[PDB]
Design a protein around this ligand. Structure first.
Ligand SMILES: N#Cc1cc(N2CCC(C(=O)N3NCC[C@H]3c3cc(F)cc(F)c3)CC2)ncn1
Length: 273
């Protein structure tokens, strides 16, 4: 189960730049990442609901999914504690000086598929899958995160409130662009994966980093996708077909993550590893 943590369990903190994200040295359980979602007056009205939600998110246990280690539910001070990921996010690793070989990239892809197929299996629909939500360890292994709290309703409300003393649309499925009421599905995440797949090979953010505008939104809704020819490095035929299939306008035409795994695992083993 979830650990109810005290600020006294930590030796000290190293605050950095949404939300106060401090690196924290725990007394016995090691190095950890902490997010102080709220600081201010007491709000005993939501403590039971916040604790229920953290217990819910704490039930998510997989090798390729970020582990929620604990919570700090103190008077007027709320915090979420996750594990430490040394190499930061997927975009940071791709935009680095050092090139990441095809074998590593192909492993990264397989690990994303696995983590997403686990989440979907537990009924979790990500809604915000993007390179910033994919964290990397020192050994280039990845874990899927929900850093923007899109799957925490109670804790997302704390982060954005009056009493507190404190994104990109390129990966968004077109059924959600200019349609905030449609309920997201497993196929909404499959679309996001397709653009993550592109970004892994282009080593950059899509659509020339043009501010999300009505012109761009309408173009993606019409059928516009990131420029495949903007990929300079070697990208196998199979991976270009996969991304083109996953970013299909019709959600019903996109595969499932267990479906993607069944075809991608043999391809990685025989051709990429
Ligand atoms: N900045 C920042 C930041 C965040 C943070 N959190 C704790 C981990 C949370 C988290 O991601 N998860 N929790 C358990 C399963 C996992 C999870 C993954 C996923 F893909 C979807 C999902 F619904 C839940 C995200 C919030 N702690 C510290 N610092």
């Amino acid at each position: 189960n979830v650990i109810k943590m005290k600020s006294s369990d930590f030796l000290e903190s190293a605050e950095l730049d949404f939300g106060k994200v401090s690196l924290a040295f725990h007394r016995t359980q090691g190095l950890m990442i902490m997010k102080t979602v709220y600081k201010g007056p007491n709000c005993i009205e939501h403590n039971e609901a916040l604790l229920e939600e953290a217990k819910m998110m704490n039930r998510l246990r997989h090798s390729r999914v970020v582990k929620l280690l604990g919570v700090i539910i103190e008077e007027g001070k709320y915090s979420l504690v996750m594990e430490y990921m040394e190499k930061g996010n997927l975009m940071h690793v791709l935009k680095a000086e050092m090139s990441t070989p095809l074998s590593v990239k192909g492993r990264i892809i397989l690990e994303i598929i696995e983590g997403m197929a686990y989440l979907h299996g537990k009924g979790v629909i990500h809604k915000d899958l993007k390179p910033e939500n994919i964290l990397v360890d020192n050994d280039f292994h990845i874990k899927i995160a929900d850093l923007g709290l899109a799957s925490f309703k109670m804790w997302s409300k704390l982060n954005n409130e009056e009493h507190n003393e404190l994104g990109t649309l390129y990966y968004m499925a077109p059924e959600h662009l200019n349609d905030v009421n449609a309920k997201p599905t497993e196929k909404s995440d499959v679309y996001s994966f397709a653009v993550v797949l592109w970004a892994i090979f282009a080593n950059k953010e899509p659509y020339e980093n043009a501010i999300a505008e009505q012109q761009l939104i309408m173009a993606i809704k019409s059928g516009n996708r990131p420029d495949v020819d903007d990929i300079t490095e070697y990208c196998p035929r199979e991976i270009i077909s996969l991304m083109k299939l996953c970013w299909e306008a019709n959600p019903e035409a996109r595969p499932t993550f267990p479906g993607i795994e069944e075809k991608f695992r043999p391809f990685y083993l025989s051709q990429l590893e």
